[model samples]
Target: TDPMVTLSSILESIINDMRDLPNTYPFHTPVNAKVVKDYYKIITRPMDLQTLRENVRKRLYPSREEFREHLELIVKNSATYNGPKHSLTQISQSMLDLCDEKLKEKEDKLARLEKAINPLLDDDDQVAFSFILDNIVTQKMMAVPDSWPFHHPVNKKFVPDYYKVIVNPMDLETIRKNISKHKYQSRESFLDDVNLILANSVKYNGPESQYTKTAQEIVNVCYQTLTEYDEHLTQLEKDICTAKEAAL
Candidate 1:
């Protein structure tokens, strides 16, 4: 199944859950700045179920992290404006918790799918695979001229709300450190981080922002390099199979 399709469905399911909540009327749409008075001033990054559903329909969330960020924002904004103990805040918190459960279920299913398709590699094969991943990260991804914004963490002082808005921040430098520490056990895990970098930029900087455009460019290079890596792995697997048949 297409992961994007699955992610969209998960988001839709969460939206539906929010809709079913007993007292979610106020959260159905954006807070009216005219009526609310200073609502926008206090809640700089406002989010609502309707806007979140629209973004899902528009396919704006390329990764789960992006969707989760918006989901969390809905709750965060509610708590900030209505107070933590308010009924609206409680309702949005429930929605966030529901989203967390659904996303966790999706992740577990994906992990099982990955395990089913990918055979365990020997120690030497693992080392070789990691070497290829290193090349992809360094030569193909990080070397891109447009990837400068994503090379390091977003400066908190410059964009104070960046960390608050983007819950799970990702950058190329962090990815490199993860690779050095052998944190990624599979290509899917590595790509998750790469996608998060692009998703974070798009969420924080807006889709039309130059930072998001640059992140997209870097992501494109990473995808192209990964395609070649996939071909290499396929050929290696075929050769191993042929050698095993000969030995039989």
Candidate 2:
């Protein structure tokens, strides 16, 4: 039977392929429905048939809820860990704005943060404070659950109220490796190591620091493939219902 034959068959196939642990594709926020839809569009390219099929079987949503929790966790860390002169609310708002896809606003706030912290970088006390402020905040708060929630918009599927949180073990290992291998004697050294980590992550994962339409495009090609599958299943459902009713 063509995988495209019926919604029921497609869904049946998907459930059977759930053998190993699934991977998570987290969309850092300001991710609304439109963002998801856009991601869906980007991923509809021709690729390996297995890649296409696997993505449909294993769909992950690290949606707005997950993104907000991370933001809140970081804000809480910043407020308590080391005393900064800046307003936490304001800083949070800035990040939220970035997630919201408000580019200029976030960029401006980032420059200001850089300026404020520039002079303090030379001082060891200030640098240490910055590291802790960033470290605790960067820690992934939510652990990925053993059972992941999956859904088809037009089928008998369970999409949880919120998407799952994804903490990539590879990401953790990379950061840990950097910490163990390099000692941050100065702000420059600290930043260099961090830069290396970011570069590698961006290569593997998507961009973490900011949002670019291009970046979003690449990050979600895998997700978009699933969305396309969802759409296909939906269409299949319409055909099935019509055919069944006609037979009656």
TM-score winner among the candidates?
1
lDDT of 2 by residue, 48-160 (tens): 22343344334321122222333343333333332244464345434444444532434454333333323222333434433442342133211222101111111111212
All predictions: root-mean-square deviation over Cα? 11.1, 26.7
- Per-residue error for 228 in candidate 1, Å, reads 30
Measured against the true structure, the TM-scores of the candidates, in listed sequence, are 0.47, 0.18
For candidate 1, which ten residues in a row score worst on lDDT?
Answer: 114-123
Clashes of 1: 0
**Residue-wise C-alpha lDDT for candidate 1, range 42-78, written one tens digit per residue:** 6757888899999988877755556777888888787
Q: Give one clash count per candidate, in the order shown.
A: 0, 2
Best by lDDT: 1
Off by over 4 Å in 2: 1-182, 202-248
TM-score of 1: 0.47
